[PDB]
Symmetry: D2
Subunit: 243 residues, 4 copies
């Protein structure tokens, strides 16, 4: 049973590869770094049971994954943009940066999803889990460009699900905040940053960052299809920070 | 492991009981019919692993449950109003029916919750899962009193989670629609009533009622605490009808 | 052209009376203090163009108002609870206080609305404007009972609008926060409470409390029926604190 | 006293021009046809008190508008995509069409808003009114691309308002559905399409198309800034179809 995970070295990627591999999936992985054959080999060495794709185009990931299996059971569309770009303000930000924000967080997942429909429908269904952000639903003053691009992909999930769910193709969005992960909250900064630790005590009812295995537990539960009627919505992964 | 499930014979009750007992729980059950001791003996014999309480007051259920075990791991607050009161209109409805709507759907879960905080905190945490309705978030023309009462309890979950999550007491709301259950979508309606399958085809992207085991899968997933960061929010169980 | 404002002395009452009287309305006012006849004549003397009702039951205010005119053009359902109670916690709170929360903020507005439909329909339509709270839509840690009660009435507006709009009976909910009013944010508090000014600088994009005349401007605009297609929704009145 | 209205000949453009001019504004108008000198002269002569711009690039509209007055009081960002591109499906749709959807509905408004910030702040504030769509908040099965692009601009309003409000720059999003307008619901469609009249009867509580003067009343009310604390939110203009 195979899963496709995008941007595997970033954001919720490590968590998704870990939990899905432990669940018995063969995890086929995309990452910008995988254009390099050497980085492909190191990744597979460091992550038993994975396959690293060379393909970089969003519309070609599905065809490239289908080289290593009969069908795709789960796609984790783990879209991200490197820090500090997520905090780019409205004023003075270049048009290139504006377009890149939508390219990485809205156009890339659309082109992926579009390419996926036909093969996934032929296999009788699958799950597509988009990793977005809390600002997909709740706005933040310092994310005035990141927020809009994330909200587009949340709306993509809720609208596209109205039609794809009848094909057995189940779409979901996760909107993390205060989630322990290499892109926005690496374990290295927690101990050194007492403003963060005070921010979490103030704003996160759970009182801690969410753990990689808890993100992994949500992903594997969704991939199992055992609760299919919750298809088509946004799940906050924020320790109670949202709503 | 102890679970308390309220109104066990109705709504989400049977689904919860089947799945929690299958996951190794001892399920302590409340139900109006359990005033009669013979009902209590029959329910227990038909459902291995369950203990039927005689207690009927919402604020005494926790104490009565703690007569059978050291701590409660999960409370399923499975509140409901007999069909067809869920469709009571605004005009011509008695003040007494209006108050009963809030009593069963809004006051009762609050008195339950308030009684549970001290013992659940002292035990190190628990999960408290409120079964509400889709109209807890999205209004429907025929539910102008049922909706308000359900929305209150969804707001209870979202607000009370801000303080209780720090005690390890994890609250959630499930808002079902088109969920195959004896109160609102019994199998008999699916078989007998031509209009229901027509409605589901038009309005439910999944194209079917939600199964009891699928509701059960969600309840036992939440009760495990493996994805604790999703605390404090509303989950649609509608097959894509919401949002 | 007559308007009915409830709890005229508190919350959004003074703003409503002032703006509506300025817009040419004869403002019939309900208030608990009006059970004392001296207070009725003091109120009418201090507020030219008002009528202070003796009536206190919600379901009788409409008939009491039609003693002074042939139709009600606008109802401002200005429900409130005396200040400290909006912060009532779950733990240790008496059943009586819980029930009074719902009585003032959820049952009283329903019983008023129920009583108004037939005369309002007979008169070709009207506007009913419910003054609720920001916590009707966005939860807050310190409002776990006030929140539920307010959310019930916002959902009442959203549900009841689905039928009553066809009668020309236009329902709206306004949800204030940081609104300069005698109940929650008197001008006294702004000068006396440096914490309030810091909190407003931090959390309110507008940077200031909303003015009574701005709340009046919202009310009179809704009462005009000039933008009727926005019927049946919740308007944040928070200086950008919501969403 | 000047306003800028974009795509003046489409969507909410005619409503905004007529109402703003009736209200005493000099309305500077952008439109794709205004590249034709003869179309500019004809529009100006058919619409007394307007000024037609030749400029077509979003980030130059403001400076071109400022050629005619010292300050802009209101900007109506009236963004649209020609029918029936709003119904573009996921499958088979070209990459260029996906990109054009975001260009017209998401990137164009962002580049306009960015260019406006500095001169609007120097004038001590202004109103910026984005005309989006009901699908910016509520998904629809047949708008899986139009929805995401609209949702991004709604999220832009909600996020950008967190900072721009302190400058007196007040942002709002209006989300029409069943709004009588030349692009999506011209009067002739109401006459030629009994399916449309039945859909409105079934789904729109108000029971009719929203009128252009009602959209103009909402725009003109927002432009007055008289109820500034409602800044930074989405207004349904749907006749109760939403929420
Ligand atoms: Cl995160
Ligand atoms: Cl159901
Ligand atoms: Cl207030
Ligand atoms: Cl429209």
């Amino acid at each position: 049973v195979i899963a496709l995970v995008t941007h595997a070295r970033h954001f919720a990627g490590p968590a998704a590869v870990e939990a899905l591999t432990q669940d018995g999936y063969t995890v086929v992985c995309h990452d910008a770094s995988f254009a390099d054959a050497a980085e492909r080999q190191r990744f597979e060495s460091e992550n038993p049971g994975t396959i690293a794709l060379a393909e970089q185009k969003p519309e070609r990931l599905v065809d490239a994954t289908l080289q290593h299996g009969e069908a795709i059971d789960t796609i984790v569309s783990n879209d991200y943009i490197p820090r500090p770009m997520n905090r780019l303000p409205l004023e003075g930000t270049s048009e290139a940066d504006i377009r890149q924000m939508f390219e990485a967080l809205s156009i890339f997942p659309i082109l992926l999803l579009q390419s996926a429909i036909a093969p996934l429908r032929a296999a009788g269904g699958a799950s597509v889990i988009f990793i977005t952000s809390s600002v997909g639903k709740k706005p933040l003053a310092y994310n005035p460009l990141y927020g809009p691009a994330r909200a587009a992909t949340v709306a993509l999930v809720e609208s596209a699900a109205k039609t794809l769910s009848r094909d057995g193709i189940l779409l979901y969005a996760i909107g993390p905040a205060f989630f322990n992960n290499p892109t926005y909250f690496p374990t290295s900064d927690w101990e050194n940053n007492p403003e963060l630790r005070e921010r979490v005590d103030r704003d996160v009812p759970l009182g801690r960052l969410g753990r990689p295995d808890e993100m992994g537990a949500l992903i594997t539960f969704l991939a199992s299809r055992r609760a299919a009627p919750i298809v088509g919505q946004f799940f906050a992964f924020t320790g109670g920070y949202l709503p």
